[PDB]
């Protein structure tokens with residue numbers, strides 16, 4: 001992955017990642033987001049409705065938690081997950097867990113890590129993990145890692161120390177297995193930075209993982225409720241300061257527009273796009289401006305004030321829902337528990353979110369991210 | 381009165397008809413299956429998808445819209461056309477079919493006591509006027525085909541009187557087309573009376589009601605044949621509540637032009653995909669590694685893009701898109717079947733088409749349903 005930075009202003013990396021994909025003729029602009037999927041599908045959106053959205057990222061995120069239970073099927077299919085799900089044109093980064101429904105913690109050992117899907121728990125060693133990636137054949141895939149040192153419970157320093165060594169042992173094992181596979185050599189392994197909330201282990205994880213020939217870095221354990229805490233924000237900057245500038249930085253569990261801008265200032269490139277999915281799942285539509293439970297970035301369309309509101313969700317929006325339907329129609333679909341609401345809302349919430357990331361790159365070119373950041377936070 | 385239907389081709393053997401309907405929101409080729417649009421949106425199918433499938437007319441449930449969001453909001457939303465943003469044609473029912481029927485109309489009681497709502501023939505025409513559909517249905521007195529006795533005749537004569545009351549209340553025949561509903565149950569005499577009485581009214585179309593309600597299939601197709609034998613040849617015949625593939629092929633042979641059924645939209649929720657050999661139960665594990673499409677000859681987005689194995693994976697997940705994929709295909713199967721029926725009529729090969737459809741569906745002709753063999757034989761189609 002040949003990464004090229006246009007400029008770095010206030011710590012924000014503006015650029016593009018070239019020479020990507022099976023043909024090597026793909027580019028990913030940074031900072032950006034990945035298309036969020038569940039079981040190889042964007043939620044509520046078929047391949048047909050997905051084409052109705054403007055600015056869909058060229059790289060999509062898959063989760064082992066939603067696909068590991070389909071290992072035998074994709075193995076017999078042989079042709080990779082992208083062609084299996086009818087999306088062979090997109091790039092695919094396979095992460096370990098799903099950000100919204102990850103499953104219960106406490107199943108990480110030095111010998112195996114577990115994920116959870118619709119059928120149940122799937123326990124996978126490093127061998128089984130690489131066998132599943134050999135069947136999925138993703139462009140990028142997160143390496144097997146120990147991210148459970150970062151939890152709400154009072155974590156021990158030895159536990160944070162273990163997550164660094166355990167993830168490194170997983171990393172060196174996956175590199176030996178990848179070098180012994182013709183198919184997996186085409187994929188790009190992503191190192192995972194761990195260490196919990198211990199600064200020393202966070203710094204050691206960043207330095208030791210960077211010493212491996214990984215193609216990128218996953219910043220794990222910085223997810224925060226309701227957002228990234230100031231302690232982990234400072235923790236994040238200390239980690240990115242130890243990472244090479246020539247490789248992409250990915251973060252998981254960080255998708256709300258306010259934390260996105262905070263992490264871009266810390267040098268994070270790629271983000272998950274599960275926040276517009278959460279907004280859709282509660283019958284809400286993003287309405288926050290970027291020109292020049294429920295948050296204030298959105299409106300609740302189950303509210304009775306939208307019974308006769310015949311305006312679009314966002315005036316001027318070019319999405320399918322806002323150019324063809326009204327809030328009254330969306331409110332009606334939600335009251336009658338119709339699945340078109342989830343479709344029409346997801347189309348707008350994805351288009352609004354993808355357009356929000358366009359404003360980040362547009363503002364970085366104009367050196368006006370501070371104004372855009374001020375406009376985002378003023379709506380809270 | 382201006383005819384809304386022109387016959388393009390007829391089967392010299394049977395009663396099959398190929399034609400097109402001239403309606404305010406475009407022309408519709410016949411025979412035509414009409415999907416229940418209120419369920420398609422509930423299935424997550426947008427207007428653009430349903431239009432892409434070639435559907436030029438769909439149904440709307442008047443009673444459903446009477447509960448949410450009501451006729452007042454639909455009128456303010458530029459009719460039902462503008463409310464759901466449907467550019468093509470719409471057919472709404474009278475909304476009368478928990479309910480008591482008197483001469484005044486159909487009575488709906490409020491839950492846990494409360495005032496009643498009276499849906500009279502005049503009220504029904506007024507409600508359907510606000511929806512702005514291109515075809516409106518008469519308010520009829522509906523009794524189930526399983527019932528016998530004096531209520532059948534009582535409901536038939538009341539359906540005729542209500543037809544006259546709907547015609548008087550319908551003050552815009554230039555914008556909406558009112559259809560009569562043949563009742564009379566499974567009684568040949570009462571139905572003949574309803575056929576003789578209702579065909580004297582100047583309505584642009586006629587519908588065959590009171591059927592497909594658990595009765596024997598022998599009593600079913602014979603009541604269809606009695607209806608088509610006495611209905612105007614130059615006006616469309618609408619058979620309500622029929623959507624099974626064999627039933628459509630047989631009833632086209634008997635002279636029906638329009639059909640509706642919630643069948644294609646519902647079995648998609650059960651994991652079943654319609655195919656020329658019947659249906660595929662894609663949720664069953666035999667399709668877990670079937671890397672072929674549902675039907676390679678189907679033009680729908682699902683079959684042009686996805687495999688049975690992938691749809692099987694989605695059915696074993698929380699993806700609501702699994703229902704979206706099957707609803708799209710099942711509607712496409714209905715439209716493809718009816719357009720193939722229509723091409724056979726235009727090309728004067730409808731019997732050969734029926735023989736091939738029955739052979740592919742059931743195999744040897746001795747395995748075909750006995751009622752369908754008799755019904756097709758009554759119009760000169762032998763297997």
Ligand SMILES: Nc1nc2[nH]cc(CN[C@H]3C=C[C@H](O)[C@@H]3O)c2c(=O)[nH]1
Pocket residue numbers: 473474477517520522523524525526561588589590591592593594620621
């Ligand atoms: N208004 C109206 N709508 C209708 N939809 C379907 C039918 C015909 N099938 C119904 C009639 C009696 C049977 O029990 C069956 O349930 C119909 C009708 O006879 N009238």
Ligand SMILES: [Zn+2]
Pocket residue numbers: 313314317318319320321322323347348349351352
């Ligand atoms: Zn929009």
Ligand SMILES: [Zn+2]
Pocket residue numbers: 674675678679680681682683684708709710712713
């Ligand atoms: Zn299909």
